[PDB]
Every structure is written in structure tokens, then in C-alpha cells.
Amino acid sequence: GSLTEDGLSYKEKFVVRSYEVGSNKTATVETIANLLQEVGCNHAQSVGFSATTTTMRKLHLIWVTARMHIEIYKYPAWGDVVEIETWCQSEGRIGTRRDWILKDSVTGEVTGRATSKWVMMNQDTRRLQKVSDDVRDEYLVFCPQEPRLAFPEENNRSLKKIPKLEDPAQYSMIGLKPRRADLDMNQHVNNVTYIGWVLESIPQEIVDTHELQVITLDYRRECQQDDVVDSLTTTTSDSQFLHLLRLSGDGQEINRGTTLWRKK
Amino acid sequence: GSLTEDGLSYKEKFVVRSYEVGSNKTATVETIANLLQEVGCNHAQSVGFSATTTTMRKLHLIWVTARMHIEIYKYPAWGDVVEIETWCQSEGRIGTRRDWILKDSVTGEVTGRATSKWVMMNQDTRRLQKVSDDVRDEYLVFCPQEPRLAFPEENNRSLKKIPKLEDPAQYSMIGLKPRRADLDMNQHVNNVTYIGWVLESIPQEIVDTHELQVITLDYRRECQQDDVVDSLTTTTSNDSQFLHLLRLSGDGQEINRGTTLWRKK
Numbered sequence A: 001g002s003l004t005e006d007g008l009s010y011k012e013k014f015v016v017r018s019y020e021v022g023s024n025k026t027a028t029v030e031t032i033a034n035l036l037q038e039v040g041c042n043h044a045q046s047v048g049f050s051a052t053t054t055t056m057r058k059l060h061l062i063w064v065t066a067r068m069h070i071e072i073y074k075y076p077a078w079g080d081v082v083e084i085e086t087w088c089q090s091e092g093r094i095g096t097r098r099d100w101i102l103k104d105s106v107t108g109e110v111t112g113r114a115t116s117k118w119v120m121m122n123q124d125t126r127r128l129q130k131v132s133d134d135v136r137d138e139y140l141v142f143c144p145q146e147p148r149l150a151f152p153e154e155n156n157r158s159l160k161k162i163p164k165l166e167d168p169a170q171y172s173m174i175g176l177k178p179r180r181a182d183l184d185m186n187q188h189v190n191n192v193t194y195i196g197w198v199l200e201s202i203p204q205e206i207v208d209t210h211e212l213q214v215i216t217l218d219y220r221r222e223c224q225q226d227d228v229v230d231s232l233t234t235t236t237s238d239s240q241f242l243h244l245l246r247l248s249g250d251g252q253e254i255n256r257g258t259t260l261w262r263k264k
Numbered sequence B: 001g002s003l004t005e006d007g008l009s010y011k012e013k014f015v016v017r018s019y020e021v022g023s024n025k026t027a028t029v030e031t032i033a034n035l036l037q038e039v040g041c042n043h044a045q046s047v048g049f050s051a052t053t054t055t056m057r058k059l060h061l062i063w064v065t066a067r068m069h070i071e072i073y074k075y076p077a078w079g080d081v082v083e084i085e086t087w088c089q090s091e092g093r094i095g096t097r098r099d100w101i102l103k104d105s106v107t108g109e110v111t112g113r114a115t116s117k118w119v120m121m122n123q124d125t126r127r128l129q130k131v132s133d134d135v136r137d138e139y140l141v142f143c144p145q146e147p148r149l150a151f152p153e154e155n156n157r158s159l160k161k162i163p164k165l166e167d168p169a170q171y172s173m174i175g176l177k178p179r180r181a182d183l184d185m186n187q188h189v190n191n192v193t194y195i196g197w198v199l200e201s202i203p204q205e206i207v208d209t210h211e212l213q214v215i216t217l218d219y220r221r222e223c224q225q226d227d228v229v230d231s232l233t234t235t236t237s238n239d240s241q242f243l244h245l246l247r248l249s250g251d252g253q254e255i256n257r258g259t260t261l262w263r264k265k
Ligand SMILES: CC(C)c1cc2ncccc2[nH]1
Pocket: A064, A065, A066, A119, A128, A191, A219, A220, A221, A222, A223
């Protein structure tokens, strides 16, 4: 992988692996989300990151995902090469955004796009906060200053408000727990694990007859290594679903989201 | 990746990813086991597989892992490039073996080795069987005919008999269930998931103070997509050794047994 000529975005190519594909012999949406994280990390490394800046390290600040939105037109097959371009943008004092474009390396055609919103948090107190002037200055060095959006379209799916699923849910998968492979290097549950848990409550007959086209997930609270999660889904419709992940015991919400599926 | 000059082994290089590493910023043993599977698959594709031979597809036969043995001297760090060489050998009518050697791409030093035993099974009845003459002929085309062992040594750990853990276990992790990411393209639980489940019952204090040096795992029965597993571990021992057992949560049917050896950091 490498920064592009202007140094304001990063590109990397990936060959889809045997264990990364599902029943159609194409990459799962969790494989796509892991590749998005990987290219994001390689971009941060290339522009001088620790994924914190110097000021964030001095103030004990970290970024946490507030929302992830992914749209896939074609999933890459086992052995195919996918090229992913990523870039970041400051959104004033609210937070930052990381966007991605996925292309088939042979045809050059756009096969998917994604966008994520990140908010600042004090890592000790876990309290959210606005982005300071020093942090915005550090981002200006490696972000495009004119807007560059993976989802430009007015009133597009990536910015829609998601409601809270009402009990009783139509479908559920109860008692989900993370194992060590679900943790990142800092022993926190990897963001992609929550996507897997959301999808666990979709009936297998939908997965067998449809392809996932769009997923929008809001992240509200972290699942700890010793927590247990319930995944709830209700059809709202193409087939569309409303999702909710909550802690098994007290019912505390950890995520809410929506998925749109196209019949094969 | 590519077959070597003689066409009897295959090599591939991998850059260790951010999500593939644990607390020490080095690849987990599950990441190593997934890379071993990936290079094995690329080798099979390179020599004409479709992972069965022509005769196997005609008779509805498949290979299943009976044992996996991995020894790691140094885990590769995040961003490091690891080169893995793999090859297969026929073991008469018993089954086949796939071996691997892991090297640091910059130093050329061997950082790990692995060996796996595979047995033939009828895909429909799930009944094990001996390897036929036609299948052995197909393997002779792409295997070295003289022995080539990742674990040559006389009384090496890879061939040791593993006993069955006696209740009560010292440690346990109960109610483990596979999710869709744990399944392969044929909707079977990926072999590497069983390694993760074995390790779940090791106390976190051991993982925080030691590095896993050797793991030997016997596979006896498949965990179905709707099954639930219990992972049991008992210490048997600067080195710590454990005995492991995975069994179905309900009836207690054994699915795997194994041993791990850990060295203090
Ligand atoms: C699970 C992670 C991504 C996460 C925790 C959290 N807390 C507050 C707001 C957003 C948040 N996101």
C-alpha cells in the first residue's frame, strides 16, 4: 500500500483469502469491514500516527466509532484482488470521518463504498468531548481541505436516523460472547465483531437467498470481554431489517442498525 | 505465492495485519493457523485441485484433519513479512500429511514449523476409510517421493499419544457457540475455530505472562453450526503444560483433545 501522489489519501490491494469467503465463494461483509480497518491503520501509520496524535497522547484522548455505513455492489470472489482507497476529513469540533472506495483491480470498476463517523473520548473516564484546536491542526496536515465524500448524494442512507427496536423482536440470537480472537491488540472487542453479532439474528434463509447491499450501524457502548450480548432483528419491509444489540442481563443498548438485502 | 523450482512445494509471503495480532503486537496462534490453511489452499489450486482430486469427486470422498501440531519460536510482529513453505506427502493407505515451515522474510531464519495428518472420509456417510491406489497415484504427481519432514527428530512431540482429561477439570469455558464468521465456504466450522475454543479455557494470567510454544490438537468429531461446546483444561506441569478437552455441552461427546506448552516471557 501507499499514499497517493498528493499525500491526501491511501491505497492498498488485497487478495481475497480462502477462509474470508462465505457460501457464494465471495468475501463476507465482516471480511470487507476488516480490510477497511486494515487500510485505515496503514494510512494512519504512513502519516505519522502512534491510532492517536501527539496531542491526544498528551491528553489521554482516543477516537471511538459512532457509526459505520457500508454499501456493496459486488463482493470480491476468493482469489480476486480488491483495491481500497481511504481518506479522512475533520468535521469541525463534532469529530472526524474516514471514507473508503472499493474497486475491482482488474476492471477498475467501483464495487463498494463506506463511511464512518468517529468521536473523541477521554480513555480513562470514557467521557465524550469536542475536538480541540490542536487536534484539528494535526488533521489538516493529511486531510483534503475541500469536501471529498464517499456518499455525496443529498439525503443519502448514511445519514438516516435509526429508531429503537420495540419488544418483542421478530428474530433473536441470545447469549453471544466474545472470545480472544474477537479482541484487538488493546484487549477491546474489535468493531467488526459487533457487525457479526448484528447479522447473527438474520434468518439463514435470508442469507441463502439474498445478498447484503447496505448496513448502517450506530455504536453507543462497548461490550466488555466478560459481557454477554443479545442480538434482536425485526423485518421493516428487497428486504429491510431493524437491529438492536443489548447486554443480556440488564438490557443496556450497545448498538442499533439497519440492513437492506437484494434477492439473488 | 508460487510453486518452487522443482514443483514439489509452494511458498507464499504474508504481511501481518493490525487485527491479526494480540496484546504483544505479534500474530496470534489462530492467525498463524489461518495463514497455514491459506498457503495450503493456494498450493492445492496451483497443482490442479477442485480440495479434492478427480477420483475423490467421482467417489464422494473428502479429507478431514485428524491432528494439527504447531511449534512457534517467534511470532511475527504487526507489519512484518512472514514466508511460509508447504508440501504434502502420502503416508501409504493411512492418509496424507501436510507440513509447513515459517521464516522471517528479512532474516531468513526459521520462526516456526507445523505438521498435520489427514484421513479420507465419505462425504455423505461420514465414514472413514483407507486411501485407494488411484488417489495415491494422483498425490505422487506433486509430492516429494523421498521423506521430507518438518519434524524429523526421533521422539518429537508431534507424534505423542494424548490422554483424555478426567473430570473435574481445573479450568473451563462453557457454552461456546460458532457464529457465521467461524464457518468455511461449505458451512462447516473452520478447523482454526477449534484451536480458539481450546485456548479459551487457559487462564488470562497465563496468556499475559507466557508465550504459547507448542500446540497439539486431535480432531475426533465435527461441531455442527447449531451445537454448543465446553472447553476444559487441567495443568499437567519456567514452562507450563496443559491437557485440553472440547466436548459437546449437552451429552458430553468428545470433539477434540490436545496439549499446549507455554514458556515464561
Ligand atoms: C464500541 C465502541 C466503538 C464505542 C463505544 C462508545 N461509547 C460512546 C460513543 C460511541 C462509542 N463507540
